[PDB]
């Protein structure tokens, strides 16, 4: 294999992490676990894998039994025909956590995995002790306001939200070429490119390089409409909510969370654009320790 | 594998088209010309070439001297580092046409070539007899209202307006794979996929498949900010204007042209989505003969 196995990757981590599999509801999920304490669930997003949490999992494993998943269609997990709406994927994680003997877990999600961490606290509040959302708010009616074009100074367009809606074309252009996508996303994100080295980038690209791997990733975005339907319907969250926002998304994230939760805390990752676990593992790790 | 050359392609048409070149402002343009009559300039868009006009050139050639170009950055034309705003590309065509001894020309364009057509009239009204615009209006403030996401029942998103803004990534993903891009666009426009055959699709892919060819293509889209600015300085067009719109862009095309010009005629291509000269050749060709008269 072009990159090491998740098995080898897990063991490279300080300390005592182990790569594993579990079948739930017909879908085999991959995850990496270790550390001792109350359970803490880490959910990554696109186009990443559990390996996105490599920088913080050690410090977090000191206080919690860390469980870093690959969502369905992500990396080492099964890549089924459907079920990529955020609700269904939170259900998978529900079954997974209970199947491992926990009635309640701390949750933390990033990007797509943040939408999933929100749909987890929304649909299974009993099984959610505290919830942390890194950067990315759950889809709502405001996704329809995203513009194709930004006036030159204004910001950055999330072009992949449009591109990932397409059938066939994404896998046709991106299969075997995800390293370039990953390189583009980091060139418009990181203050320092060496924050995510060549090998780590290749680990992500290998997870996504096959045509079925690219297609599954897109399913996450194609379920945007559904996710938006489902969001209107959710009651407010009662359990403690943590929102960590970068410079790009902090106040949008604060606006939405305070409108969707009664007990909210906000932290600003002042040196990060999007990839908080990789960009500021220091701040993220500490924030989640304090919060939990 | 390889496709026919532009000289071969031009000679395959009825009747009398020759494949040519002219150096203007140091930039070398490829074009195909033929026929007899008043000069008719024909400008294509992304990701096509002059060959997009194959179905309508023979009819038009019976009445006009047809000059069907490849824009700066397109097909057989040079691909310099800059100059991809519509005003500069219009100047190119203005230098070309005048250098061929034509003080005034009829002009029709499509897609990106429609923006160029419009820019040509806006910057050189003395050199523009009349102008026709197929489907695509010139960039203005409304481009900043286009949405990344449409609701399920709603019209189609122009995802490539966003994608082609990018540096480096588009070459990296599309080089060698342009046939797929072209198939997606036709899958989402043609009523019947045989309206544009395999060989014609490969003719476009080949022109666009190199990293530099893709990069050039995106330059047309990246110049949108500049084009929008330039448009805010343009006075209304007073020469005769013809807008030919697809079935789902007609209303938008009309409202924008009647706001930007004073003498407008509209034709609806009501079996077409976007590639008008390929989807309704006889409607296009007819609308142009009647309007250039």
């Amino acid at each position: 294999g072009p990159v090491p196995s998740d098995r080898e990757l897990a063991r490279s981590l300080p300390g005592g992490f182990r790569s594993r599999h579990a079948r739930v509801g017909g879908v085999r999920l991959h995850y990496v676990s270790g550390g001792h304490g109350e359970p803490l669930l880490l959910v990554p997003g696109w186009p990443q894998t559990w390996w996105a949490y490599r920088k913080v999992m050690p410090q977090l494993a000191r206080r919690y039994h860390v469980i870093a998943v690959d969502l369905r269609g992500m990396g080492g997990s099964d890549k089924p025909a459907g079920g990529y709406d955020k609700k269904t994927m939170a259900a998978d994680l529900h079954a997974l956590v209970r199947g491992l003997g926990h009635r309640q877990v701390n949750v933390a999600g990033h990007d797509i995995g943040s939408m999933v961490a929100f749909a987890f606290a929304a649909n299974h509040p009993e099984a959610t002790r505290k919830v942390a959302l890194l950067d990315t708010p759950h889809p709502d009616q405001s996704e329809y306001e995203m513009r194709i074009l930004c006036r030159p100074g204004t910001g950055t367009t999330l072009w992949w939200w449009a591109f990932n809606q397409l059938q066939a074309l994404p896998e046709q252009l991106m299969h075997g070429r995800m390293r370039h996508v990953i390189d583009w996303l980091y060139a418009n994100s990181l203050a320092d490119q060496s924050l995510v080295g060549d090998l780590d980038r290749d680990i992500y690209a290998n997870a996504y390089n096959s045509p079925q791997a690219v297609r599954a990733g897109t399913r996450w975005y194609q379920a945007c409409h559904q996710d938006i339907t489902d969001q209107a319907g959710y009651g407010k969250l009662t359990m403690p909510v943590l929102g960590i926002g970068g410079n790009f998304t902090f106040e949008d994230l604060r606006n939405k969370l305070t409108a969707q939760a009664t007990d909210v805390h906000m932290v600003r990752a002042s040196k990060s654009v999007h990839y908080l676990p990789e960009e500021e593992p220091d701040v993220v790790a500490g924030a989640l320790l304090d919060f939990f």
Side-chain angles (χ1 to χ4, degrees), chain A residues 1-22 24-62 64-102 104-270 272-292:
Chain A
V3 300
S5 64
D6 283 335
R7 190 178 226 66
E8 303 178 275
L9 284 182
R11 290 205 240 94
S12 69
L13 287 205
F17 291 94
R18 182 168 186 173
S19 176
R20 289 172 127 121
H21 296 272
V24 295
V27 62
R28 178 170 142 104
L29 295 174
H30 168 256
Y31 71 100
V32 162
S33 84
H36 281 290
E38 264 278 282
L40 159 46
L41 186 70
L42 302 177
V43 192
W46 183 92
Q48 314 197 290
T49 67
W50 69 274
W51 187 245
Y53 287 109
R54 78 198 169 273
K55 291 178 171 194
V56 297
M57 284 180 189
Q59 294 138 108
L60 291 168
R62 254 190 290 277
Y64 308 99
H65 179 65
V66 179
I67 298 144
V69 286
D70 281 338
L71 293 165
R72 78 154 67 182
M74 178 183 296
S77 295
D78 271 4
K79 281 154 204 157
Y84 297 95
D85 62 278
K86 304 308 151 300
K87 183 166 148 181
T88 299
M89 298 192 76
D92 292 333
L93 295 190
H94 187 72
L96 182 70
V97 159
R98 276 193 112 200
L100 298 189
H102 313 264
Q104 263 205 334
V105 293
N106 298 298
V107 183
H110 175 261
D111 195 82
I112 289 293
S114 178
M115 301 164 185
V116 169
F118 183 100
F120 184 96
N123 292 284
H124 318 99
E126 58 286 3
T128 313
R129 174 179 126 196
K130 294 175 179 250
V131 74
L133 310 137
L134 283 38
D135 213 43
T136 310
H138 187 281
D140 53 15
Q141 213 63 208
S142 74
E143 305 308 308
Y144 290 120
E145 289 307 297
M146 288 189 299
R147 314 280 182 186
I148 293 285
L149 285 176
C150 286
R151 301 199 167 60
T154 306
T156 62
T157 268
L158 313 186
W159 59 268
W160 60 94
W161 270 87
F163 189 74
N164 286 342
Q165 307 295 322
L166 305 182
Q167 298 313 129
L169 192 58
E171 70 193 58
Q172 289 166 340
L173 302 188
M174 290 190 175
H175 82 265
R177 296 184 175 183
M178 284 301 298
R179 175 58 190 265
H180 303 301
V181 180
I182 281 132
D183 284 345
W184 185 96
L185 297 160
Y186 285 143
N188 290 262
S189 182
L190 310 173
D192 198 302
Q193 289 314 304
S194 64
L195 283 170
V196 176
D198 186 63
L199 307 95
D200 298 307
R201 301 184 186 217
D202 279 337
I203 285 154
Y204 299 126
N206 176 249
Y208 286 89
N209 263 329
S210 83
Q212 320 75 18
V214 170
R215 171 196 309 135
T218 64
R219 293 302 159 68
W220 295 335
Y221 289 83
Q222 293 171 0
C224 58
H225 307 270
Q226 183 66 52
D227 289 326
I228 284 152
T229 313
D230 297 8
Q231 183 268 340
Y234 291 165
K236 284 114 79 196
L237 310 192
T238 56
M239 87 260 65
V241 170
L242 181 62
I244 323 189
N247 287 312
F248 186 79
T249 57
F250 181 83
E251 209 175 309
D252 181 76
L253 178 63
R254 161 169 66 195
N255 275 43
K256 307 193 180 312
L257 282 189
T258 68
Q260 301 160 338
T262 69
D263 180 12
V264 156
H265 295 77
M266 290 299 302
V267 169
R268 184 192 270 269
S270 45
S272 307
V273 173
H274 178 73
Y275 294 97
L276 313 180
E278 290 175 311
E279 276 178 76
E280 270 181 302
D282 30 53
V283 180
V284 173
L288 304 172
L289 288 172
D290 298 23
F291 175 69
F292 291 125

